[PDB]
Design a protein around this ligand. Sequence first.
Ligand SMILES: Nc1ncnc2c1ncn2[C@@H]1O[C@H](COP(=O)(O)OP(=O)(O)OP(=O)(O)O)[C@@H](O)[C@H]1O
Ligand SMILES: [Mn+2]
Ligand SMILES: [Mn+2]
Length: 295
Amino acid sequence: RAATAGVRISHPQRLIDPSIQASKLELAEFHARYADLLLRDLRERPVSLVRGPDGIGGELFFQKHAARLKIPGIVQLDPALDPGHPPLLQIRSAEALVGAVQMGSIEFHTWNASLANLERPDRFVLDLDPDPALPWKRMLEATQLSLTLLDELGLRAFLKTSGGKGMHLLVPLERRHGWDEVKDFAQAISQHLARLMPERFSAVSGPRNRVGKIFVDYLRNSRGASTVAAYSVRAREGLPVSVPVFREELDSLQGANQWNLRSLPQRLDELAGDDPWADYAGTRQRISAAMRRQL
Ligand SMILES: Nc1ncnc2c1ncn2[C@@H]1O[C@H](COP(=O)(O)OP(=O)(O)OP(=O)(O)O)[C@@H](O)[C@H]1O
Ligand SMILES: [Mn+2]
Ligand SMILES: [Mn+2]
């Protein structure tokens, strides 16, 4: 089990994605090999799991709480954090991560807060959701415009492909605000973009409210909500991965799912050390009165 963080994998050969002949064992080995990359995000944050017992061809189970986990190493959080439900979950090691895969996990989504203080978010996320028939160039243009607004506000933003059809923007924040304040700030940004360019942006959820447009989703900033982790796999055809990218290579991207679990190694080799999110951990910023004025 040297390639699976010491974890025994049952039914190693069952297929997670038949389209590319990716097995459960391959998926486990991927998480063992890149455990450190995924932990850059999961290590100190509660995590929600997307489990697919029968592969992407079957149905998915989105789990937030668990009464009796069977993942050696998985941490069960205090119920007081979410009364009326079993304990939340946290993965802090490669063993726990691979153990989750052994139990059917395919995707890992994390909270916008860390164990240091789960009542004060340390980031907010903007998820650009396009019309299922909108040209890719529209997403690129929308992402560029969103980054421009963030720069005017004075906030550093870190982007990554979602692995699906859109782009994710993560904005770190000092733990000085409560959940409602951060969510309202994110909503303010969405609404602002929707007012400036109503032909491109929408601040209202629902596909019927973004026909031929892009929805700047701010709803994942609610307490308990989560966003797919950087470098994590998506339970979709080809097993694409959510990949952090430089703003400079934004216009060179062709799709939100251009990288997958098997092409990630090549991506990392091409970068050869270059880290798109190198300045993430060192970023120190907070919601200011000036920011609110601009919105
Ligand atoms: N079955 C579910 N029930 C409730 N919430 C879910 C469920 N599945 C996923 N979610 C949450 O809602 C969000 C939506 O995931 P989704 O893949 O649809 O958006 P995405 O990560 O941006 O990919 P895309 O670019 O295709 O929109 C996730 O971040 C997840 O936390
Ligand atoms: Mn989305
Ligand atoms: Mn969304």
